[PDB]
Design a binder for this molecule. Structure first.
Ligand SMILES: NC(=O)c1ccc[n+]([C@@H]2O[C@H](COP(=O)([O-])OP(=O)(O)OC[C@H]3O[C@@H](n4cnc5c(N)ncnc54)[C@H](OP(=O)(O)O)[C@@H]3O)[C@@H](O)[C@H]2O)c1
Ligand SMILES: O=C(O)COc1cc(Cl)ccc1C(=O)NCc1ccc(Br)cc1F
Ligand SMILES: [Br-]
Length: 310
């Protein structure tokens, strides 16, 4: 089902993630997702696969499998486009690739701006990211323009910490509040403080990496594994569900949106089968208890940026 955003639109609480979905597999992944019921796709220019996502979206619209109004397509402004005069063209490139004339939601992908150019991570000779002097507030004003030009129906933020959310909410002359803050969230990083702050302000939180991103490129064999945690397996077994299904249902019952990624057709379908069972309150609190402040999405080359959020 769907959650009401502070722009008046409804957002499906379950979406399909596309980071790391290979370009030769993601068109079929998104076709399968729409065929089995998904109506929300999470995209980003930096994922380098929006053309191939778009081929799937467009084919399903052409085939009349779904209407555009029924889809909720999200993408994100990359860090090298935080500049007033680059935001619109970045949005338009994403629209072109996705074969759309609007996005349902467009996010500032990270609070940090980087030097524009070809490189997504421009580095100095010593390996530090090179910042942009543009502030989160001027980037937000540029996002607000996209609403007013009809390119996007909603704007939001991603990886913004408490203080950064507050900065936006306190922006002089704020025209549109952020509708969403998309952040990493799973039983090893439960985010209770940031979620309660955002929800108290009427901002909907989307949980990314809800399975722990086991395919993240910097994974190590020794790292914690949610999918293999026997405690979570035990809750799944009790409910006759998979561990992944429990990990997807968990954020749903916290009033979060969740965006698990898969390119495996059988898992795409399995991951959607989460509307026919309920975790108990005790199950929810037990899952919350596994927090270890273990963050899979972080990056050393960006840790000296003034706006690095963590
Ligand atoms: N805003 C941002 O900064 C940000 C950062 C990270 C992620 N995200 C968004 O969040 C989405 C989800 O996060 P994520 O991609 O990091 O990881 P994730 O969804 O936590 O995990 C994806 C991994 O789980 C596997 N998997 C999926 N379903 C499974 C199932 N039922 N059983 C066993 N394994 C399963 C997938 O394998 P297969 O694909 O091989 O099936 C893939 O290796 C991303 O794709 C992206 O859209 C946003
Ligand atoms: O950022 C994401 O959505 C997922 O992670 C990545 C995806 C791609 Cl395609 C490339 C690189 C990352 C990646 O490294 N993301 C981490 C990241 C990025 C920027 C900043 Br300011 C901080 C930070 F921790
Ligand atoms: Br950042």
């Amino acid at each position: 089902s769907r959650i009401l955003l502070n722009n008046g639109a409804k957002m499906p609480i379950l979406g399909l993630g596309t980071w790391k979905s290979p370009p030769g597999q993601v068109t079929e992944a998104v076709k399968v997702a729409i065929d089995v019921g998904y109506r929300h796709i999470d995209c980003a220019h930096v994922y380098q696969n929006e053309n191939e996502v778009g081929v799937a979206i467009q084919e399903k619209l052409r085939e009349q499998v779904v209407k555009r109004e029924e889809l909720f397509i999200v993408s994100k402004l990359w860090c090298t486009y935080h500049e007033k005069g680059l935001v619109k063209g970045a949005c338009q490139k994403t629209l072109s690739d996705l074969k759309l004339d609007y996005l349902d939601l467009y996010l500032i992908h990270w609070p940090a701006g980087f030097k524009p150019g070809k490189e997504f991570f421009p580095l100095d000779e010593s390996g530090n990211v090179v910042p942009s002097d543009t502030n989160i507030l001027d980037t937000w004003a540029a996002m607000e323009e996209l609403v007013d030009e009809g390119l996007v129906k909603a704007i939001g933020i991603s990886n913004f910490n408490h203080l950064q959310v507050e900065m936006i909410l306190n922006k002089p002359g704020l025209k549109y509040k952020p509708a969403v803050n998309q952040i990493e969230c799973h039983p090893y990083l439960t985010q209770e403080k940031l979620i309660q702050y955002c929800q108290s302000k009427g901002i909907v939180v989307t949980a990314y990496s809800p399975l722990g991103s086991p395919d993240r490129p910097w994974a190590k064999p020794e790292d914690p594994s949610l999918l293999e945690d026997p405690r979570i397996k035990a809750i799944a077994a009790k409910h006759n569900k998979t561990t992944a299904q429990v990990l997807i249902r968990f954020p749903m019952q916290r009033n979060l949106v969740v965006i698990p990624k898969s390119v495996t057709p059988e898992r795409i379908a399995e991951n959607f089968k989460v509307f026919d069972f309920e975790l108990s309150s005790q199950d929810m609190t037990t899952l919350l208890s596994y927090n270890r402040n273990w963050r899979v999405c972080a990056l050393l080359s960006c840790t000296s940026h003034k706006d690095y959020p963590f």
